[PDB]
């Protein structure tokens, strides 16, 4: 699809068996999801943006279906104000910015 | 152009006669640049990022070139990890996300 930027680029994702709404975010290096449980090993990480840093749990090798397209990679879990699909997974679904 | 996302989508911008680097950020409604001098009056605005809220100075109707494309619109000035081009200006340059 061609997603307009007149509105926030929100899509439905499936992660950990759960449906969520998330932002397709070219400004995010990594994918960050609100608090949830995920299987397997994790390690702590700090990520920063406007207003400073939050602590997250880093889970590797997690599958996420993004608007119907499956992708595997690292997912960060923590107190983010919005679910964010970052570049690490946008690449895997072939997303590009066009103008 | 067609910009893939294996690297950060950094472009050159021109504002006030000066070249700067900025990140094309579909996850931002608005454009935020690091401290600089802009003409005219400003208004107050709060931005809630991943780490919390910050105060910024809102300047309206500012001339800015983005990757060689001309825009005239709102620029926020305040403390950001990186200059961010948000949707208010991505729409002016005709950007879309595609997959
Ligand atoms: C290492 O991986 C990282 C992943 C993400 C981030 S980040 O979320 O901090 N961020 C990085 C960027 C600042 C360099 C990605 C940005 O796209 C974030 C994503 C994000 C959106 C909303 C809330 C938190 C984070 N946007 C803004 O900072 C940002 C900046 C401006 C100037 C405006 C807005 C904006 O439109 N809103 C705050 C509206 C809003 N509010 C809520 C609650 O949701 C949304 C969509 C967002 C940092 C590290
Ligand atoms: Cl990854
Ligand atoms: Cl590619
Ligand atoms: Cl604007
Ligand atoms: Na894992
Ligand atoms: Na000034
Ligand atoms: Na103005």
Swiss-Prot record, chains A, B:
Name of the protein in its database record: Protease
Oligomer and partners: Homodimer, whose active site consists of two apposed aspartic acid residues.
Residue ranges constituting the Peptidase A2 domain according to the UniProt record: 20-89
Described purpose of this protein according to its UniProt entry: Aspartyl protease that mediates proteolytic cleavages of Gag and Gag-Pol polyproteins during or shortly after the release of the virion from the plasma membrane. Cleavages take place as an ordered, step-wise cascade to yield mature proteins. This process is called maturation. Displays maximal activity during the budding process just prior to particle release from the cell. Also cleaves Nef and Vif, probably concomitantly with viral structural proteins on maturation of virus particles. Hydrolyzes host EIF4GI and PABP1 in order to shut off the capped cellular mRNA translation.
The organism's taxonomic lineage, starting at the top: Viruses, Riboviria, Pararnavirae, Artverviricota, Revtraviricetes
Native species: Human immunodeficiency virus type 1 group M subtype B (isolate BH10) (HIV-1)
Signal peptide bounds: none
List of catalytic residues: 25 (for protease activity)
Region annotated Dimerization of protease, chain positions: 1-5, 49-55, 88-99
């Amino acid at each position: 699809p061609q997603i307009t930027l007149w509105k926030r680029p929100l899509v439905t994702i499936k992660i950990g068996g759960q449906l969520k709404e998330a932002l397709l975010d070219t400004g995010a290096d990594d994918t960050v999801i609100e608090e949830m449980s995920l299987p397997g090993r994790w390690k702590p990480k700090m990520i920063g943006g406007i207003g400073g840093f939050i602590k997250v749990r880093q889970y590797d090798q997690i599958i996420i279906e993004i608007a119907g397209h499956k992708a595997i990679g690292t997912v960060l879990v923590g107190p983010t104000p919005v679910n964010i699909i970052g570049r690490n997974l946008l690449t895997q679904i072939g997303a590009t910015l066009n103008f």
